[model samples]
Target: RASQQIPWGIKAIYNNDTLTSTTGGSGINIAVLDTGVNTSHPDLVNNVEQCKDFTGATTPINNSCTDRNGHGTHVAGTALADGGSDQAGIYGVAPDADLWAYKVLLDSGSGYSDDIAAAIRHAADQATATGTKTIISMSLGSSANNSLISSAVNYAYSKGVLIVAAAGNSGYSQGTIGYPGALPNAIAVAALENVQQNGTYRVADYSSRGYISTAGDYVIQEGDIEISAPGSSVYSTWYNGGYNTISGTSMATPHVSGLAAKIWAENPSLSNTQLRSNLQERAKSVDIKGGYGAAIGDDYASGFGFARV
Candidate 1:
């Protein structure tokens, strides 16, 4: 089976018990908003499109849109890594999907809120101008909330762009979902650990929770976390034409992102709302306890269970 060679993260979504489409997301274009992509990586080279660097770094490493920190490259690999020739077997969820590199973060894997906001707007504008259905995959997060970021996400959402973000790594607590993920519009994804030894997958101890409260507001917003995906010890492409295994909610975000693209490819007419609804409805309930011992369904740790397809 093609999915057997793929990582466990992909396996969890494509397994027999919870069957879903593995379309490779041929026609959809996904904008990866992160530290950028290697562009020359063997598995990812063919699928990478226009690359732009928003971070104003004078040094060549930081100036170019090419990956330096390796985080973005890993995230991209999970979404569109082609299993061809030298890289056979190992593949991404939407291996044939088009990937646009938006270098919002610097070589150090950090960027300003304004830069990220600009990148979000840029992706939406490009999609609107080209009349293309676009999905934005953001693997980065910030504890601070900026109006600029919120406004940009809202703008993209209004333009029919689907945005997927990582639920922050700060976990073992409640109401820690980071900005952008905390935003009601974006599909915030939490992390689930793949414990093959136990024959069960559980929510990661570090995956963030829901019920976030804004500065001015005292009320905690429920349902901040929309879904969960395999994020622990996941393998993907790395910088300098290499591959490695890493873990975090960052790893989980792209699984949902790529699957969302596949779903969009299957039916381009589905609106963001409809797409989100379909995903929520189709997700398999992960029968595991939360970090705080809460039941699985709609819990703070794992959102609408683990995302499938």
Candidate 2:
């Protein structure tokens, strides 16, 4: 008997309602660029397609792709945890999605854009060679833009690899979205809490607000906060073969990535661009507002609106 439990965040995004046994992101490969994944975690072990370490950590573990600080494990679980081999654990957004773990960030929770860029290129190359419909989900970013990372993201976009990135947590104030997320090629997702600060899920005060641009067609614009998703008290797998709850735009990013993966699997014939458009089209309903941000239809606070399957 499979006894998988859906976390609040998953329910909030409607993955529990839409994801099925077959349309569970089986054909999609999502490369997670973060600290690394705990490949041994029951919920994640079987989903891992490959693991590589870009961080030159002093004491490495598990094919140099183990999570030391737990961020990567948590993030991976959110994106694609498989609820254990027997389905007796927590469920992730795209439980059947193949995983490629790239340890771009060090155990210290900091990493250079060069390593991140390399990981992005690696994911892009694998997707191109294998003819796999792949998505790159990054829960990390930097304040300043890096040319190397931008080129890599652009390269991946050109190669038809979908990149989903997090808006930084510095949203306690309105500076700007973090690097890759700020870049136009990558889809920037913001965070929201369960409580509706306005009429929709409240944009988390910590979720970085994008530029206050006038709303346009679903086409992504530079510095536009593409959408919002569940990020508060997000419960997912931990590095120690267990579970933990945390919050950030980092947490919110996977919901959109995982949902996109799930949806793309259902529409196997759709191009990444079409799928991107489809997702943005679906997000137009659940608008977001926050304690500290304005709630104009498409303001710096939230983009199209809260994303769902």
Candidate 3:
């Protein structure tokens, strides 16, 4: 396994004082719906709790919530784990937030749609009662047509749970938008490359776009494409005390999830809708294809813009 520091790389964008004061995502709770999170890892031990498995074949514990594959660990690191010294891999958007891990996917990185939908309902219910605003970071998608999963996403949203998902790694040429994420109420994140070659922030070529309507009538609303984050050359924790560099909207989803946690930490009173809207409104816009110009509010490729926290 390739090992990289847990916090270094592009995560420095979230550590600034302007972002730390009310943006460290103090008490927020984020649900990681992926392969699983390694609860035993030292970097993640302090904050992770409530592991569950919605896989249905056995106990939720079998799903383990610990990363057998590295995807979950990387996503978890972005949302909550704090990188400690050396100023290298010790970076995360919300170093103090709590993470709830749920393994809905298999080692192959796929899962039953029913299992994934159930996890969304579970997280939404849990987050609402605790007053700890919850964000569900989903990195998995399916070819199986699932309207039920879409409803589940909307259900979570109605319960004030913010759902963030990878817009699929297939990119623009995939022929169709991925499920659940393509559904309404879910924030479908696109991948951005580190363009300046500087590695700080840039949009990637593989990100997805939204259509105007089911018939592909209009080109979709500006911001309707959602938002984007650093997905290429992103560095984060891996399973078994290792590290790796990865790309995809899977990485981007967690950035927004972490940013959502930061927003909740700053304004606990804000509704889930408000938090989602604020992110879309305050994102840092970059000029890209599908995007109209260099401004704020909404655009095709970048949505409201890139996440600053």
Between 2 and 3, whose TM-score is larger? 2
Any runs in candidate 3 off by more than 4 Å, and if so which? Answer: 1-12, 15-23, 58-63, 84-89, 143-145, 197-202, 212-223, 284-297
For model 2, how does the per-residue alpha-carbon lDDT over 11-72 read when each residue is reduced to its tens digit? 87883544433228988998989988898998889899888888764322236687888999
Write the residue-wise lDDT of candidate 3 on 1-309 in tens digits: 224433333443453433322227777888999888878766677778668887756645543675688998888887776654323344567778888998888877788877888889888888877866888999777534486788789889998888888777655543334766666688877777655422234456676654433212212332245767767778777877756678888888888788888887898899987887777655643323432121233444455556665
Q: How many residue pairs clash (N, CA or C atoms closer than 3 angstroms) in each of the candidate models, in the order given?
A: 0, 0, 18
lDDT of 1 by residue, 1-309 (tens): 133347778878766444232346877788999988988887788788768888875322232588888999999988878775465535788987898888989899888888899889988997899888889999988777789988999999999899999988998588777978888888888888875322346778888877633221312243367777889988888877678889999999999989888888888899988888777766544443544523534556666666675
TM accuracy, model 3: 0.83
Write down the TM-score for model 1: 0.88
Task: Assess candidate 1 and give its lDDT.
Answer: 0.78
Better of 1 and 2 by lDDT: 2
lDDT accuracy of residue 288 in candidate 1 = 39
Sort all candidates by TM-score, best to worst: 2, 1, 3
Candidate 2 lands at a TM-score of 0.92
In model 3, the Cα lDDT at residue 72 comes to 89
Error of 3 at 233 (Å): 1.3
